[PDB]
Write a protein that binds this ligand. Structure first.
Ligand SMILES: *[C@@H]1O[C@H](CO)[C@@H](O)[C@H](O)[C@H]1NC(C)=O
Lengths: 581, 4
């Protein structure tokens, strides 16, 4: 009896209708000449990789795969879906049926068929597939990543790997906007050199291959001139630059005004409108223009429930067709409640786009952000139609957070951040999943103790036992049971991190090796901290003085380490223990 | 070096 494996995103409607069956070593492929070229290629790579030959002629004793779009006239597909249809679903939707030795995929459109194949790829383990009836479609139409952080831009190989990863998780958007690319911002007028344009072409091609909308961003707010000949010339520089990327296949554009000194709301919006009319609309096959205003968090946008000067004028002027992004109540903030999206959607009289600054860490580079989407309201889709996360300069470990963003944006009302977090690590880390959870569990909360705060609290279940222990001691209760529980947790912290150091692939390890060393140190310091409590209860001062020096030794190492992790849990416990009782 |  074959079970449904981990899926991501969580499909909207899935029922098991059979025991499952084993896919034969050679399959009948049906509808591939009419079906979406990218879907079929994804399917061929998968088949090749899992050693499944495709029959040159029909063989009745071999599994049959039928694939196609609603708008292909292919009846063998309607027959095999067995009353299930993709006809009535929203764009990017699909239907999938596996039953009685046949697998049928029907996409509402091609994007849909590609996503149907991704789910097919996820359902097969070792040639076995469950027998299921699926109809599936996204909550949010635009889902993906804005590469818009400060610091070391992603490499070419980072981005190509990222793009393949988006397609596998049905993320359909990637915005190119690295702050430290000189041609994106510092020197936005200058054309890309020939060799960089060759790298660009590769990224564009891979994007199309994986159904990702590659958005080319530009940030001219540093030094753009708006008026007379200078404003003409500067405007034509935007046109020239977008044209040269259009001519390579780019069909999405963004013009950003964030983090600049000039706050000319009217001029910003007029540039957008002019570009929207002379470029986006003229071309006719270019997707809606994206922007971010110079005021882009509720705090900077709104005062006493009423829009600020910049925002009011910008909202008044910007054409309704342009997507406008905002980061929520602060630049980096715990939550975006429904009421915040309602307010801002109200000022703009339109559905908004989110620029979510998590897991970005450019504001506190010592910590990894390894937690799930957290504090984003599950009804946000009432006011939000475009969702993007800003990742870290660490592309590999950003995958954990993005994985959960794929689930939240595709099936948002079903989204369980703990379940989604667990699934991300299970799917991405495999044999090492259990141990990686132990480590990652301590690295979900970002707090620069100033204005940036976001993410699930660090290992809450452990913080609760620690808190509980200080009560049992100040309350004179028998704590001996809790101390053994806690010794166990600290040993496992050490065990897990040593295992990761030994066994993680370079691609993950090269990104977090320093933080593993830090958590091992703190685990050792928490253990000595308990030894201190034990010795204090035994009025055994020799053991106390010895444990205390070790505790100070481990703490001294962490405070001087670049690495930051478990500030308020593993670290604080040692600081707590060094404060009498 | 970052926002805010
Ligand atoms: C502002 O804030 C963050 C964090 O330092 C940075 O990643 C991002 O590039 C900036 N811009 C926006 C629109 O959030």
């Amino acid at each position: 009896q074959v079970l449904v494996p981990n899926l991501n995103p969580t499909p909207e409607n899935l029922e098991v209708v059979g025991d499952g069956f084993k896919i034969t070593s050679s399959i009948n492929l049906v509808g591939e000449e009419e079906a979406d070229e990218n879907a079929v290629n994804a399917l061929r790579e998968f088949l090749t990789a899992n050693n499944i030959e495709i029959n040159s002629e029909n063989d009745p004793n071999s599994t049959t795969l039928i694939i196609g779009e609603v708008d292909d006239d292919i009846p063998e597909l309607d027959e095999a879906l067995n009353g299930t249809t993709a006809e009535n679903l929203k764009e990017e939707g699909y239907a999938l049926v596996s039953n009685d030795g046949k697998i049928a995929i029907e996409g509402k459109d091609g994007d849909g068929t590609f996503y149907g194949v991704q789910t097919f790829k996820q359902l097969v383990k070792e040639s076995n597939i469950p027998e299921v009836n699926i109809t599936d479609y996204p909550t949010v139409s635009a889902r993906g990543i804005v590469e818009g952080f400060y610091g070391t831009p992603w490499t070419h190989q980072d981005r190509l790997d990222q793009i393949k990863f988006y397609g596998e998780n049905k993320l359909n958007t990637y915005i190119y906007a690295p702050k430290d690319d000189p041609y994106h911002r510092e020197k936005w007028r200058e054309p890309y050199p020939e060799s960089e344009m060759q790298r660009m072409q590769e990224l564009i091609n891979a994007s199309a291959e994986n159904k990702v909308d590659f958005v080319f961003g530009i940030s001219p707010g540093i030094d753009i001139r708006f008026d007379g000949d200078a404003g003409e010339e500067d405007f034509n520089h935007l046109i020239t630059k977008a044209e040269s990327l259009y001519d390579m296949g780019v069909r999405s554009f963004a013009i950003y005004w964030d983090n600049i000194q000039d706050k000319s709301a009217a001029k910003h919006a007029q540039v957008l409108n002019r570009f929207n009319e002379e470029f986006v609309k003229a071309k006719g096959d270019v997707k809606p223009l994206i922007t971010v205003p110079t005021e882009y968090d509720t705090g900077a946008m709104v005062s006493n429930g009423q829009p600020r000067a910049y925002t009011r004028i910008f909202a008044e002027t910007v054409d309704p067709s342009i997507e406008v992004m905002w980061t929520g109540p602060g630049v980096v903030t715990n939550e975006i409640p429904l009421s915040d999206a309602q307010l801002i959607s109200g000022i703009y009289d339109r559905n908004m786009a989110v620029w979510w600054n998590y897991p970005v860490t450019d504001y506190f580079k010592g910590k990894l952000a390894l937690g799930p989407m957290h504090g984003l309201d599950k009804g946000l889709n009432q006011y939000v139609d475009f969702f993007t996360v800003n990742p870290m300069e660490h592309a590999e470990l950003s995958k954990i957070s993005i994985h959960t963003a794929a689930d939240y944006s595709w099936n948002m009302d079903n989204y369980d951040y703990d379940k989604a977090w667990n699934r991300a690590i299970d799917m991405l880390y495999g044999d090492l999943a259990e141990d990686m959870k132990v480590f990652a569990n301590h690295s979900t909360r970002m707090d620069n103790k100033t204005w940036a705060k976001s993410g699930r609290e660090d290992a809450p279940e452990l913080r609760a036992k620690m808190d509980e222990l200080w009560n049992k001691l100040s309350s004179k209760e028998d704590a001996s049971a809790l101390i053994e529980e806690l010794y166990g947790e600290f040993a496992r912290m050490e065990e897990a991190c040593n295992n990761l150091k030994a066994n993680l692939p370079e691609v993950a390890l090269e990104e977090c090796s320093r933080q593993l060393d830090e958590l091992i140190t703190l685990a050792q310091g928490d253990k000595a901290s308990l030894d201190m409590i034990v010795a204090q209860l035994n009025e055994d001062t020799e053991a106390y003085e010895s444990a205390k020096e070790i505790a100070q030794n481990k703490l001294n190492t962490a405070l001087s380490s670049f690495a930051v992790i478990s500030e308020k849990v593993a670290q604080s416990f040692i600081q707590e223990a060094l404060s009498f009782a | 070096a970052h926002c805010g």
